[PDB]
Design a binder for this molecule. Structure first.
Ligand code: GGG
Ligand code: CA
Ligand code: CA
Length: 278
C-alpha cells in the first residue's frame, strides 16, 4: 500500500533516504495487534481512529484527554492519515493529568495495569505499550517498565528532551525496554533529543503532524513523538509475524537504516527505524 503526501516521518520510516513523501507499507497495517498509549488519554471519538481507539483506565476523575498530547501520540501509532500501523487497536491509559503531569506512583500503576490487562483483550498478533513520558531516574519506575516488558508487552519509551544522556531519566534508562530518540527531516538528531548508550533506536520527532483533540490536527515535536513511531512499527512487524514482543526492539535495531544520522554523539547508536518495505 502507498500513502502519498504522508507526514514526513511516515515517509521516512519506509525510505532509505530523507526527503520523500510517500509512506509505503504492507496493507495488513497492524491489524490484530494492540498498542496501549500511556499518557493524557485518547479522544476515542476522533474520526481518524475509525472506532479502533478505546480508553481502558484512568487515574483521574475523567478518562477524557483534556490536553491533546495523548491523542497526538495515539494518532502517530495508528490513525488513518498520521499513523504507522493504520489498523491496530489503540487502548488509552490516562496516567497524566490535563497539564501533562503525573506522579511516579501513577505512572507505575498504569504500567502494572497494562501488564495484567492485555491478555484479556483481543490482541492475537501481540501487544505494544507506548510511554511518551518520563522524569528523573527512579529504580521503581524502571522496574515496573521491565516487568511490563517481561509480561509480554513490547515497551517503547521516550529518551527525553534534555539534550543529555538518557541514563539519568526514567523509564528511558531501563535497558530491557526500547528507548527511542528523535530526529528531524534532515536526518539530524533533534536539538532536544537525549542520547547515550541506553538508546536503542531513533525515529522522527521534530515537527510531527498528528491528531489533536476536537477532531483536529497539530504538529508538535519531542521524543514523545518519536516513541509512537516505534510503537506503531513494532505493532506492524508483529502483525506480519517478523518479530514478537520479546525480540522486537532488537529486530527493529538490526533492520534499521544504519549510519544515516548526524548530530549523533560517539557511543550512541546511529539507527533509524525502518519498515524494510519494497
Ligand atoms: N513526573 C513525571 C511527569 O509527570 N512527566 C511529564 C511528561 O512526561 N509529560 C509528557 C512529555 O513531556 O513527554
Ligand atoms: Ca540511507
Ligand atoms: Ca534497550
Amino acid at each position: 500500500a502507498a500513502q502519498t503526501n504522508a507526514p514526513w516521518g511516515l515517509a521516512r520510516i519506509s525510505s532509505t533516504s530523507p526527503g520523500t513523501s510517500t509512506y509505503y507499507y504492507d496493507e495488513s497495517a497492524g491489524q490484530g495487534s494492540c498498542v496501549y498509549v500511556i499518557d493524557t488519554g485518547i479522544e476515542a471519538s476522533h474520526p481518524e481512529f475509525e472506532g479502533r481507539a478505546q480508553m481502558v483506565k484512568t487515574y483521574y476523575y475523567s478518562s477524557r484527554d483534556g490536553n491533546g498530547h495523548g491523542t497526538h501520540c495515539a494518532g502517530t501509532v495508528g490513525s488513518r492519515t498520521y499513523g504507522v500501523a493504520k489498523k491496530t487497536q489503540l487502548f488509552g491509559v490516562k496516567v497524566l493529568d490535563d497539564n501533562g503531569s503525573g506522579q511516579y506512583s501513577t505512572i507505575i500503576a498504569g504500567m502494572d495495569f497494562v501488564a495484567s490487562d492485555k491478555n484479556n483483550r483481543n490482541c492475537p498478533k501481540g501487544v505494544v505499550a507506548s510511554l511518551s513520558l518520563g522524569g528523573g531516574y527512579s529504580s521503581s519506575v524502571n522496574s515496573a517498565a521491565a516487568r511490563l516488558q517481561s509480561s509480554g508487552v513490547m515497551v517503547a519509551v521516550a529518551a527525553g528532551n534534555n539534550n543529555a544522556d538518557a541514563r539519568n531519566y526514567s523509564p528511558a534508562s531501563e535497558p530491557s525496554v526500547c528507548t527511542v530518540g528523535a530526529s528531524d527531516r534532515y536526518d539530524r538528531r533533534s536539538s532536544f533529543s537525549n542520547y547515550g548508550s541506553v538508546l536503542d533506536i531513533f525515529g522522527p520527532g521534530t515537527s510531527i503532524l498528528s491528531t489533536w483533540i476536537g477532531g483536529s490536527t497539530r504538529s508538535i515535536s519531542g521524543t514523545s513523538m518519536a516513541t509512537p513511531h516505534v510503537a506503531g512499527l513494532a505493532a506492524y512487524l508483529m502483525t506480519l509475524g517478523k518479530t514478537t514482543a520479546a525480540s522486537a526492539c532488537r529486530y527493529i535495531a538490526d533492520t534499521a537504516n544504519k549510519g544515516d544520522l548526524s548530530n549523533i554523539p560517539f557511543g550512541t547508536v546511529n539507527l533509524l527505524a525502518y519498515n524494510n518495505y519494497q
